[PDB]
UniProtKB/Swiss-Prot annotation:
Post-translational changes noted in the entry: Activation requires a sequential transfer of a phosphate group from a His in the primary transmitter domain, to an Asp in the receiver domain and to a His in the secondary transmitter domain.
Location of the protein in the cell: Cell inner membrane
Protein name: Virulence sensor protein BvgS
Section of the entire sequence shown: 292 to 526 of 1238
Job of this protein: Member of the two-component regulatory system BvgS/BvgA. Phosphorylates BvgA via a four-step phosphorelay in response to environmental signals.
Length: 235
């Protein structure tokens, strides 16, 4: 399907194996634990991409987004397999077309004093992952919510479970994933947030004309039915 240009063809002939950095514990998008194979929504999407491009992908798992960006910037990785589209990073990263678009929700404890929904956050403590793209959007929409940060989505979920926050912001997809698998009976999805949907995309540095155009064409040739099939497995 995808119509690659001559320069793109050249790029792919010089890069038959492309180095894809992925966050080890960005469930259910990328999951690359000690010592398991690479899995998650984005693992399946990359395989479909492999068919569309003929490229082999070498997967580089890292714990932190600082690491993943450092490896893009140094050229050790060619692309990232899953990141949130984030305008604050657009001066140094490019994002592909999104392959997941998903509303965000708050997760609370199942206790009588928990916020009932996103309109009941006044003076409440809302946890978000440090440097999350949702932080300024949440601060503008819900200026009375008290924002605390956590290192990563696990720590953020645990702040609610252990009582250091009243609510945590996650995509609906990751919230259902973490709640059902780890906190069933302790946490719950309270409601949607009145914020633009989060989006998951591939990323490269801004220099990368040919590879990003290859990723976009290849993504374009994946139907929404294919994507929905993959994503629905992680509910």
């Amino acid at each position: 399907h995808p119509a690659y240009s001559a320069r793109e063809q050249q790029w792919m002939a010089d890069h038959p194996v492309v180095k894809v950095a992925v966050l080890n514990l960005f469930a259910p998008f990328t999951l690359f634990r000690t010592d398991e194979q690479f899995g998650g929504i984005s693992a399946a999407v990359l395989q479909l991409l492999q068919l569309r491009t003929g490229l082999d992908f070498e997967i580089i798992g890292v714990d932190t987004v600082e690491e993943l960006i450092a490896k893009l910037r140094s050229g050790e990785a060619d692309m990232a397999g899953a990141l949130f589209v984030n305008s604050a990073r657009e001066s140094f990263l490019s994002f592909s077309r999104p392959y997941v678009r998903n509303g965000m929700v708050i997760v609370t404890r199942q206790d009588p004093d928990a916020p009932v929904d996103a309109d009941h956050l006044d003076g409440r403590t809302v946890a978000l992952v440090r440097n999350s793209a949702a932080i300024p959007l949440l601060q503008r929409r819900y200026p009375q919510a008290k924002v605390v940060t956590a290192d990563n989505p696990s720590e953020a979920m645990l702040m609610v479970a252990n009582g250091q926050a009243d609510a945590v912001v996650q995509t609906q997809i990751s919230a259902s994933y973490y709640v059902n698998r780890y906190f069933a009976g302790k946490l719950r999805i309270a409601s949607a947030l009145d914020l633009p949907p989060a989006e998951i995309a591939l990323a490269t540095t801004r220099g990368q004309t040919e590879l990003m155009s290859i990723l976009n064409k290849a993504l374009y040739s994946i139907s929404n039915d294919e994507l929905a099939s993959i994503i629905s497995r992680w509910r």
